[PDB]
Symmetry: C3
Subunit: 552 residues, 3 copies
């Protein structure tokens, strides 16, 4: 069994000598290679990509000059007056505010905010919580002022919820503020970290798309401007602005590039419905005691929340990724073989020589694919008991009958016409169904008698036995003896077994002569006339003829 | 060399005419195709998937009515009384609180919190920082009240750290609060952004799993209820609740679907040990001066922190992804070939005809694979100097001896039995080791003499030379001359070279006759008797016979 | 057409009996298999990996003892004195502070902070906003003290911006604080969640790289120490420290492992330039009224912001991933075939036997690849009208002339030398260009006359017709009749058609004899002498000879 281990199977091939097929093969190979290489390089499919982990540190710079009040009061706003302590992925800049000082929890009328006017106590409902006015109604309409009445609520009073944001915005000068963004990113899998500020950077720069795309200092008004947003208008009600930091990082030494790209995107919907809280604000309370009572000052702060959005991937060469990609693409190099073999198979068909070619003489030189197909494919049939081959001296072709004989003579049964082989010129150099007058009834049992009910021809005429070739090949005892001696050099030409050997050799000689291929000759069926002439020449002294036996 | 460029290699094939193998091939092809198509569609392997970047904007609505104190004091809590300014990925709702007003940094007893009772100054340690009481011990036990003593600490006093959260929770009515979540998501690579609130949405809706799965307004109690959590109990100590927003987005126009799925998950461990800070709270200080001293009010706020967890991917058709997947799956279409070829190889074995088939007559019709194997595979051997073939007229097979002759006669040396070919019926139509009496001693040097020590047979009997076929094929000068003239039409039948040519042709004729295949005949070894009869017929006038020469 | 459906194509193969090629094949197969298995297991390419979603909950423990002031004042700092309410992905610990109490918006000199000294009103600019001093200049230099002058600004006064952070840091004892980190992670696609604190964990542990790698309680000084950072120095100006939590989670039951790895990384640049805001601090304002004026206390808080960075992936077995990987790797098992076939093709070349082999006798036994190549590849040519084969009795080879005859005799036209086949030994057993004296002028039209202008030889000598083999094969009427009867058993040997059949058979017999292969014989060109001898033997009674016709 060891020898069976040390075996190598190699495919048999036909190397074709063709300009067209060679050119097609090479063009297709180069097309596949070019595309797979382009996909490998463009999409970096030799790299393992890793998402980043980010830390953000923001610092807002700027002082706003304002004129509040009546009287003209001049003041300033510094960072502690308009920012929250948070300095990470989001920072808030106050641009507008409403202040309610000295609030007490008691009864008061609700602010008449765009539809809260009340005409009678019927409209007001006692005990009903209003999340807008932020109080509990008493069910009594009372006069907010000398012109309009509003429902009475138990709330922090005076109640100013629903009052409109000041216009113009009090801290609209925040458009001139600047924010410095410090961004640390890391790729833990690749063990790589970098930051967005490197040594040698200009400290007096301000970000610009073209002139200063790497300056991490942003004027807020410029942020709004770059994407066609108006800071002055957004300042009244506030909003949410996205600062996007994209890191497309190549960590291969020969192609190292890890730099941030800055972009801006408004994140709050401009057309948010009035009942859905348009803009951005929060309510901040400062609590104190005065006049022996628990009081509160309410700040409604409007402004812009800036969300720092940091995203990206880090690419480094990985062997496994490259191997997987190459393997995924290897099968595409069979395209040339598939296409050319399809061409060979299609143009070998007969439908072309008879139908396509007369209509179009351009694709007639492609008749050479018949030769290629003959050289490439060997058609064979499954050897089954019903397989039979018959040849008629009248016809030039062979008939295949792969069906049972249900008592019908094989002469009448129809089959599939198949062609005769090339013959290897180098080697060479009164039953009713009968139409020859020499056939005899079959001596087999009636169950399998139809197999032998066969004549040399389908139409009346001379029997094939009359030809001298028949006697030379089939009936010549010298020729059969020579063949047997070639197979068995020391065979004994005596006994009743020699007659059986000669009869079998004569059968095989007729079958090879009239069918050429051993594949057909093995399942060929001899005509009755030839069969009985052979048997007469080499008769069985005692016993019954078995006839055709299934080889498998 | 140009012609060598324009070549195409096509595989030689045998097309089998079988119902079973065709059916198996097509079934396997369809199975592979169906599975690869299902994998392509189910997992969207034609798409490039991109993670989203999210912005969240939350707004809590609700007013709580409370009854604090003794006396019955009625009050309300609005958003500024129970929320932090932050309104992004997390928002906090206060549900309970402990307040410590007018704290002074001085000495005081520590709160007796579940095991802090002290019986003597021995238990207390001076200068030891207690992170629980949040003070520095003095080492002196002092009376906290008229029943129990506790260690004295320098701390913000009065010290209430360790005091239990109020039960029931003061702002347990926050279960009736609602939060509106506005969620902006973007897929920068696909240049796609959308939000979770679209025009035409109902503003008076509240979220429900079935009735209103797309309403972004959530009642907090409902959040807890949907996942079997009790808001009233969690309100006492607080906790962390996750609101999950899943975006499974298909960005192909023909299959566009980008909508959020909302789910809830408690994020704080219910069974957190008492020493590990169970629930959620933080300590918030308000600082002031009174009575000429620096005082502080401490708020211990208990409540629920809601974490908004937004995740998902965006899929869009990508050509490279599709090409890579198809290539990764192409090789699976060789399964039919692998399986059917394995069947052919296995059932061609002899082990079946002798062992399996008698035991089971069901798998006997599969003997047709011997014919398929003969038509498919041509076995050949490596041509090496030791390769030799010998045939004995007694035996019906051929012997291969691929081993050196270490002085042992080739007759005695054993080899591997190999079969004789079909013979192409179409073309056809007193040394001790000697057992024939006609062999002679070898004239070669003793080093390589054993090669020629070969007889026509392994047992005593008539020599093969006695057959008339031997004289007709090997010794017939006319036949050899005819073969030579076929090879050389104008050959000259004179000189001593013609005898050498005739001798070589006779050797080749014997070798082809007794071995058929040129592969075996090329390495066949002639018996001594036949060799010397040939040499006698065509003897060398002057010189020494070289004998068998290695062709390669 | 149904039978055409039930077909199976199997490749014809040559199984080689070689130790070297079998060993090479198996070694290469095992190498490919080992590598693909290693890649599958190491990189878990049978798993679908999913990123985690995280929630973080932090709690800082610790009380700092301090000595502030002059007078010696003793105090403590508890969590509310040094932390913000936020307890999620980032927490802040105050380590140093500057306090500015009782600020009023008025005019004051700016703090002389490292280059703000002013020598005259020329340096100062009126109306110019200074983001550093956080005030608006008046353009007048005024004395900050009795030694140095500074620009006058309208700002919150007294103005202390630019004052250096205290050294040593007031809350440098925060190095002894501890933080407990609770981390909840989930893999929504795999429906898996876990936390970093499991039942049975030691509550009195502190994190250590080796002794306690799973304790989620971290001493801040230890965090700084593990990565060679000095907390005491960073405390003066502050900084940003990263706590990294890596989750490499295997969610397969047989290989379940989902545990966090803790690592630390400083996130703020140590060498940040003085103008870029080195360290970490924020300005926090407390507003009040006193003496009938609006006053503010400004806290500049320095400290360490700790960023909790949670990242990782969850792996679970997925069938589609495994199928895609196996398919991507299947083609690599053709490596053995590619390599061995390349060896066969290369060593079959002639360049070796003549050039490489004499130089190196080591690679001479590899001459056996000529036999393998002959057994593997059948070279054929494209059948085109210009294809012609000629043989000269003088030469031992065949000539191929695949070119047009532009009036030049085929004898003179040069072609490509091609070898003669093996001949199937088993089957066997006065024109100027003329050099034989028997050729005659061609009777074809002058357009195509050059094709027939061919002689049996390229040099003067005896004509091939003189050989007896020529008469036996080509001119023997009996032999041609026998061949025809073999093809047509009942052919009629009468009429003028029999002469045409005999002439064609004689042409084919000469072509097969002198070219062996039917491929060459089909496009072979007969010499004029042989052609006209054949025509004389079997002449056309009436008509003109057509000569060679293109078969395709
Ligand atoms: O509290 C204030 N800012 C803090 C803060 C800002 C932003 C984040 C956060 C929450 C909330 C919103 C409140 C902190 C504030 C201060 C001033 C003082 C300067 C103008 N007055 C100067 C006298 C004129 O001479 C005016 C108005 C406000 Cl609303
Ligand atoms: O400070 C309070 N909330 C702010 C805040 C809430 C939450 C986030 C953040 C931090 C911290 C925790 C403190 C801000 C507060 C207010 C009240 C006032 C209403 C009840 N008293 C009304 C009189 C009755 O007539 C009562 C108790 C508290 Cl704890
Ligand atoms: O306000 C303070 N901390 C709160 C806070 C801390 C950090 C986060 C955030 C923002 C900002 C920065 C302010 C909250 C504070 C408190 C003390 C009191 C204890 C020492 N004095 C005790 C008397 C001695 O007997 C001293 C100094 C300060 Cl700056
Ligand atoms: N191919 C073929 N073989 C035949 C035919 N008739 C008989 N044989 C073969 O001849 C053998 C039977 O010999 P037969 O002359 O019929 O009688 P028997 O040999 O005395 O039993 C079987 O092995 C058959 O394979 C025929 O028509 N065609
Ligand atoms: N296959 C085979 N070839 C043989 C044998 N003996 C001789 N030859 C061939 O015959 C040639 C040697 O001729 P030989 O009659 O021995 O003597 P020589 O030709 O006068 O030197 C060699 O080229 C061999 O290939 C044999 O036993 N088997
Ligand atoms: N291969 C080959 N075939 C030839 C040659 N000359 C004639 N033929 C064949 O012979 C046939 C023409 O017959 P020919 O004797 O020339 O005259 P015809 O048959 O009376 O028209 C054609 O079908 C050719 O294929 C030749 O030189 N080489
Ligand atoms: C921003 O600064 C420029 C500087 O000249 C000034 O003209 C402009 O008014 C400023 N914007 C606001 C809103 O004050
Ligand atoms: C921006 O909005 C303001 C309203 O506050 C308006 O006066 C101004 O004209 C707007 N700017 C542009 C460029 O539309
Ligand atoms: C929530 O509102 C319902 C409305 O009827 C009320 O019955 C219930 O008591 C409220 N829950 C709390 C905790 O107050
Ligand atoms: C929820 O917890 C509270 C305790 O505050 C309890 O009274 C109530 O029965 C609980 N609800 C359920 C449904 O268990
Ligand atoms: C930290 O605690 C140790 C405990 O002995 C003490 O020696 C050390 O001084 C403390 N560090 C600071 C900065 O106070
Ligand atoms: C850390 O920095 C402080 C400065 O505050 C210094 O005194 C101390 O020596 C430093 N420690 C080390 C180990 O360098
Ligand atoms: Na493949
Ligand atoms: Zn008949
Ligand atoms: Zn007949
Ligand atoms: Zn002998
Ligand atoms: Zn013998
Ligand atoms: Zn001539
Ligand atoms: Zn001639």
């Amino acid at each position: 069994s060891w020898n069976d281990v040390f075996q190598y199977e190699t495919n048999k091939v036909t190397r074709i000598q063709s300009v067209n097929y060679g050119t097609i093969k090479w063009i297709l190979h180069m097309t596949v290679f070019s595309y797979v290489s382009f996909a490998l390089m463009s999409d970096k499919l030799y790299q393992r990509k890793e998402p980043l982990i980010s830390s953000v540190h923001t610092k807002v710079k700027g002082v706003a000059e304002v004129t509040e009040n009546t009287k003209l009061v001049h003041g300033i706003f510094d960072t502690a007056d308009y920012t929250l302590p948070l300095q990470g992925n989001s920072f808030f800049v106050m641009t507008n505010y409403l202040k309610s000082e000295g609030q007490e929890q008691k009864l008061c009328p609700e602010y008449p905010s765009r539809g809260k006017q009340c005409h009678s106590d019927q409209g007001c409902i006692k005990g009903w919580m209003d999340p807008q006015s932020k109080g509990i109604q008493t069910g009594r309409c009372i006069p907010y002022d000398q012109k309009r009445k509003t429902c009475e609520i138990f709330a922090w009073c005076p109640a100013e919820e629903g009052k409109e944001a000041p216009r113009p915005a009090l801290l609209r000068s925040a458009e001139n503020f600047t924010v410095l963004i410090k961004n640390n990113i890391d790729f833990p899998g690749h063990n790589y970290t970098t930051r967005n500020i490197l040594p040698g950077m200009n400290i007096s720069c301000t970000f610009h798309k073209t002139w200063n795309p790497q300056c991490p200092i942003f004027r807020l008004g410029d942020i709004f401007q770059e994407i066609g947003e108006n800071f002055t208008e957004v300042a009244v009600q506030g909003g949410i602005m996205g600062i996007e930091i994209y890191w497309d990082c190549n960590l291969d030494s020969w192609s190292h590039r890890c730099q941030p790209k800055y972009s801006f995107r408004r994140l709050d919907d401009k057309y948010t419905n009035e009942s859905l809280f348009p803009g951005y604000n929060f309510r901040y309370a400062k609590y104190y005691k005065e006049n022996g009572m628990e009081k509160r000052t309410l700040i409604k702060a409007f402004g812009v929340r800036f969300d720092i959005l940091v995203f990206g991937t880090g690419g480094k060469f990985d062997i496994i990724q490259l191997v997987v990609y190459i393997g995924s693409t290897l099968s595409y190099f069979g395209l040339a073989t598939v296409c050319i073999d399809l061409i060979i198979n299609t143009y070998a068909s007969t439908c072309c020589r008879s139908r396509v070619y007369p209509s179009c003489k351009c694709c007639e030189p492609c008749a050479v694919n018949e030769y290629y197909y003959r050289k490439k494919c060997e058609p064979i049939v499954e050897p089954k008991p019903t397989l039979k081959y018959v040849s008629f001296v009248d016809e030039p072709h062979i008939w295949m009958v792969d069906q049972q004989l249900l008592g019908k003579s094989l002469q009448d049964v129809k089959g599939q016409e198949v062609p005769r082989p090339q013959t290897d010129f180098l080697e060479l150099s009164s039953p009713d169904w009968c139409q020859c007058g020499n056939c005899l009834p079959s001596q087999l049992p009636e169950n399998r008698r139809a197999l032998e009910e066969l004549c040399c021809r389908r139409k009346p005429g001379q029997c094939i036995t009359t030809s001298e070739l028949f006697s030379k090949i089939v009936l010549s005892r010298e020729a059969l003896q020579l063949l047997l001696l070639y197979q068995e050099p020391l065979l004994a030409l005596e006994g009743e077994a020699i007659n059986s050997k000669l009869r079998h050799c004569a059968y095989r000689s007729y079958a090879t002569w009239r069918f050429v291929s051993q594949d057909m000759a093995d399942f060929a069926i001899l005509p009755s006339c030839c069969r009985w002439k052979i048997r007469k020449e080499f008769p069985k002294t005692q016993g019954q003829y078995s006839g055709f036996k299934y080889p498998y």
